[PDB]
């Protein structure tokens, strides 16, 4: 989560029906857009951010939310326009001995700005004495490992989270949703629509 990945999506089409009609998502919440209306909207660009957090932290991924993840790992803007999707990944991101490859920023002197990624691993100086890269009192590692295990509770089990931020700026509309066509009938008075020409 402290190193949440991001991908740009532009100049393409996607059928969001497979998305919001899929039951494989534990959390599916859209702000500023109707989940069932995605195929009906075009956007200049989209950002797909991806990471893993435990269930109890899933609620922090939303505008106006605070907490360790919201403040130090991943922050959303209050005017965020887009959707948040999350689903348990216990079978994938948990291990018998504890999956410690997932970490979250536990120390930070300030909160992250919207869509800010902080990957600094510098020893956090909690006192006046500098740490000089040596752990000790007032000197703690800024990241904390989840150590996910299959026996952890739902709120502690891992969840893969994807945030889709749709941006409809003054640039030409590039990302859209493919509308299914209909069979063609000849020699009958009908209403036609060919690639938008009606």
């Amino acid at each position, epitope marked *: 989560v402290y190193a949440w990945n991001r991908k740009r999506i532009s100049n393409c089409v996607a059928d969001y029906s497979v998305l919001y009609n899929s039951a494989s998502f534990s959390t599916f919440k859209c702000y500023g857009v109707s989940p069932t209306k995605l195929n009906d909207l075009c956007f200049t660009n989209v950002y797909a951010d991806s990471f893993v957090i435990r269930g109890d932290e899933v609620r922090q991924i939303a505008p106006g939310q605070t907490g360790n993840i919201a403040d130090y790992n991943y922050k959303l803007p209050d005017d965020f326009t887009g959707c948040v999707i999350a689903w348990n990944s216990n079978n994938l991101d948990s291990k018998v001995g504890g999956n410690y490859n997932y970490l979250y920023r536990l*120390f930070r002197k300030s909160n992250l700005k919207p869509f800010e990624r902080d990957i600094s691993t510098e020893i956090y100086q909690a006192g006046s004495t500098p740490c000089n890269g040596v752990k000790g*009192f007032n000197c703690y590692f800024p990241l904390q490992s989840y150590g996910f295990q299959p026996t952890y509770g739902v709120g502690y089990q891992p969840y893969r989270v994807v945030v889709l931020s749709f941006e409809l700026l003054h640039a030409p509309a590039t990302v859209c949703g493919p509308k299914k066509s209909t069979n063609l009938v000849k020699n009958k008075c009908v209403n036609f629509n060919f690639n938008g020409l009606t």
Partner: antibody
Amino acid sequence: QVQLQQSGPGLVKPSETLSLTCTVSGASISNYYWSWIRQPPGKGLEWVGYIYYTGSTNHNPSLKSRVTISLDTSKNQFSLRLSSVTAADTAVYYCARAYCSGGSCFDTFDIWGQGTMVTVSS
Amino acid sequence: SYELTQPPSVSVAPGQTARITCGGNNIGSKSVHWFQQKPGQAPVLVVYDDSDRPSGIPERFSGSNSGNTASLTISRVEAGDEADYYCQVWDSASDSGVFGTGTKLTVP
């Protein structure tokens, strides 16, 4: 709820090595400073030393030459060894956890063990 | 060696305000913490960071640290407040915890 339990010899002969063990239950022994405090009869609390999960250890200057603090994360325990114990070492020994809020461990102790009485008598 | 001095005992009737003082050179520049210890019980943190109370500590307890003196104030002393109060600071020069001599609070 984190609990600390102290075990060791209730009676130790003079000049022998006193070995006390503190077991942590309900939470991992990692990411916390674990300290030993001794209360001699009729005297106030005296700090003996602390050990961090990374192996960093510090001890009271008056007891540095005789005190060794070790950590066993596999058993979620930490041990205090006092060499050449004397009658002055007869005391109640507690293990305590440094108070860590917001990830910053303060110089205070929030969780204490019930204490174990050690008597140095021949 | 850095030392902390506390009154040997303080007697305050129920409902009154008890003030326990902890003396030490430059203690005002250090974070002073107050622990409570009942007979036969382990010390319990009552005040930290010179004003802060751990969750569950009644509001009647309060801490202050000015100059070379720290003060623990117990408003409306109750029969349950009878105990030994210890002030603890951290000497960064020796990186060690220094405890006060302890004050026996009694409630006649």
